[PDB]
Design a protein around this ligand. Structure first.
Ligand code: NA
Ligand code: NA
Ligand SMILES: [Zn+2]
Ligand SMILES: [Zn+2]
Lengths: 55, 55
């Protein structure tokens, strides 16, 4: 029995490229056929390309 | 671009059933066709059914 709780997703702004931590539910709600950017993050702590990557 | 860093795996000892956090590399090294138990955890902090689940 295994479970993925969280998934990292990369911002596709060529001047950012930061990895953001999403819940697995939120990652499931991303359209893979389109680019993903920081501003699409539901986590308001990490929803902007100017904010450093989460430790 | 997405990446799973960690995966939770459940102990199959009927008197334990605890979830343990594995790296995605370690989870990839588990044989799904066999039961998994706490003692199979490479993480010595959480490799025994008597140890509480990680926060
Ligand atoms: Na540039
Ligand atoms: Na019992
Ligand atoms: Zn960004
Ligand atoms: Zn156990």
């Amino acid at each position: 029995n295994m479970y993925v709780n969280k998934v990292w997703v990369q911002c596709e702004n060529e001047n950012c490229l930061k990895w953001r931590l999403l819940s697995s539910e939120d990652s499931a709600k991303v359209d893979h056929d389109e680019p993903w950017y920081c501003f699409m993050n539901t986590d308001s702590r990490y929803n902007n390309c100017s904010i450093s990557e989460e430790d």
